[PDB]
């Protein structure tokens, strides 16, 4: 069998997440006789069954593409991405088709210009990789075919997903020939930033909301202009935060700024001081200057045309829903509420917004009925008050990100008309914490959308390779996330009982986790329970089993937006701008998670029209050091990336590929003269079906000969062992040849 | 698609789409004929009126309520007011949408074997299902507990529930209405 002494195998380690070891002995079929670096000798377990991962010949390692490995697993990846950042500091890789791009926090030369005039051209794997080398591929796709492109980046947001779409449109603005897209692009950076970025537990600055800017090309492909989208935004973070989170960093930008002059109709307090920024109880984040970052959040919107007018409009407007949160309820009886006289909260939102306090303070505590003959002004519990507060604070938040989105892109449009375009999607990956929770599951419902779109397209990028090469496609195995998709999204789904739960009446958490465990706890593989608890439920996704916990949920899903206050804010006339932001029924009675999925069915209509590319982001170290690589951080970021859970779809199949002239050059080593033939093609046929005897391994294309996992290890470790035992032969023979000369020489 | 929701009454028909905040139809529940001899030639004398229309020219007619007592009493009145209520008064049709369907409790079996035969074979409903009035009056108002007292034209009657449980043992009905109060 394949393990012998000097042999590598990969041990696992707490320290360091493998470890690698040398056999000492050749394996027999319950114990190994394992050297180390860490001493010369140890004795290791096999375990009831088990065998560690054997580690690739280094031919093979720090390959430019990770599926020329042909062992694939998570320490093969891990150590060969280890070794080329680490030894060559070339931070891209490949995987498949994807890019891994490794962000150093050090700054590096080979973005500079030449580089870009070097990549165009090349195709895809003629050069080492690089972001350019997508850059192109999807530019090249471009031009050739009438499909527009579009590449989507991945992961935590300190990975450095804005600085690779940044080089991507440097690369499209000076080969298409430019003016000032991307100047205009990069100064909107720190307003979506400021409007749409949050503070989150594992990680500051954490973006939640996905972005896409459509790069517009002429029918002579040079760039007119861009566009931009946003989706998924979590509108549940405005009203509520989990323990050590804040809300949009805005707020506190905002609060931060109190003192100054144009602030103080505002009444502004500490950011502490207000009940939405108060509660996670984490107001001032180590290490930044929020008045900074208001400044230059202002001369961003300054360099994009949003008049001070419109500045002191939003700010007012965030101001308002400050204000509105403090607005508390006393309720007279358990069915009813009022608002305290001469509430300072609510006279201060009035005078903000201009709505005249008696409407205000009757709408809040009452909604209207009406058929079209009567209408009836019903009260309202203390809760439904709070839950309809909420609401309204979310949907003027909500419209007046649209809002600012709008007048982005109507400084990043120009007036030609947009032949064909180009998008680059910066959106969050996949995510765990020892707490998750109704964003967290929003996040990995569009997490598992966006993995079927890539499988399936790897898939048929892959039957086309397939039918190209001759061999029967039929082979090729398909791995398909459906059934988890249905289980969150389909008819009696987690979602759609989350919002039957919401509707009817005393619902509760522990009522919808027992309406749970009833529809699915064993009518579903992928659903499941934890044992010592009733509050949370587990759904194993693409990469990982996640514990969601109940507590949140109802709380958060709710909106309902009551049509009077709406009414009444609109008809204010103080100011342009509260007006404009609801200009133009059912999507009121919509919950967030509604919102959400239908969000997300625009996102994947988007994407399906188009051709994909992808990038994937890994954050090598927690603390920014300009090199260090964190074994441990980058194997959580990988699987996070979904990235190892493809590499162990392609090991499935048949990952490496040889063309039948560099493989009659590699193992002429092993081939015999006799077997060498005027046909190289039919003598590696002939070659290849004796030295590996089922043909299920492998198959014949017309150019290109295909292998299963380890069989390119197998050959080269053959070969290995015959080119070393003839040196020792031949070594041997000219030592004793030498030697004997010797003798003969003392014999003289 | 939309489920339509319709509850009849002894008086009021009220009808609309499920998910709606009020009803989108409501009209008295009315068959009348006309009683006088038609003078003028060309007029459009017209069988028989219903609902809104029935109460306009009621000077004109016989008012005849096709439901006493929760009971519906004449079948060919009642499928003309169903008729009325799909066709020209929500304007949909009922191929397309499920159907609920209300009743008082502890009414006749009859009542509800012909009305769920009438929806199938007369209109094609593709499903429909038939609830309890006070059943439904506790989802109006909230509540998975209560004693509820519903009384409208027609029955009166108690339901006590207590945790989404019925107690059939304690359910009452009684005939006062609406409609003994006005006579
Ligand atoms: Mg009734």
Redesign the pocket.
Known sequence: ELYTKYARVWIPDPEEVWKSAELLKDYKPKVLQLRLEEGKDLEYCLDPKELPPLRNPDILVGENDLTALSYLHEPAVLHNLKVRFIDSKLIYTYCGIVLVAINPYEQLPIYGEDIINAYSGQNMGDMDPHIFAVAEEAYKQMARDERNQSIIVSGESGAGKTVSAKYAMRYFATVSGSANVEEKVLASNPIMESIGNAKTTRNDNSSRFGKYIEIGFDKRYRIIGANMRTYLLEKSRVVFQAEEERNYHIFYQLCASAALPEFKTLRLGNANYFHYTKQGGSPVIDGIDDAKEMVNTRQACTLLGISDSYQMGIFRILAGILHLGNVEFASRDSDSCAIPPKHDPLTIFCDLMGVDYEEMAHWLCHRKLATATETYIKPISKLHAINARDALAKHIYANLFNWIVDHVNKALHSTVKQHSFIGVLDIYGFETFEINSFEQFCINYANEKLQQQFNMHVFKLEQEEYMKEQIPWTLIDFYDNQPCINLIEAKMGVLDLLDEECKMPKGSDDTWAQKLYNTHLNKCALFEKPRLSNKAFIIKHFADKVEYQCEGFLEKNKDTVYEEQIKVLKSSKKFKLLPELFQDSKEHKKTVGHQFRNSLHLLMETLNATTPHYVRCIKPNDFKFPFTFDEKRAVQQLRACGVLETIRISAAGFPSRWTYQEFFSRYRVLMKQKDVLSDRKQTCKNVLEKLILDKDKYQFGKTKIFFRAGQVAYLEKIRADKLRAACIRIQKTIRGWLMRKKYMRMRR | TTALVC?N?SGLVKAGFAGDDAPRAVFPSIVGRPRHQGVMVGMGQKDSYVGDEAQSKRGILTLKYPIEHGIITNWDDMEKIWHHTFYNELRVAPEEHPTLLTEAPLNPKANREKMTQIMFETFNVPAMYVAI?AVLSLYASGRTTGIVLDS?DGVTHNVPIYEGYALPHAIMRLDLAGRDLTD
């Open positions: 509850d009454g009035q409208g």
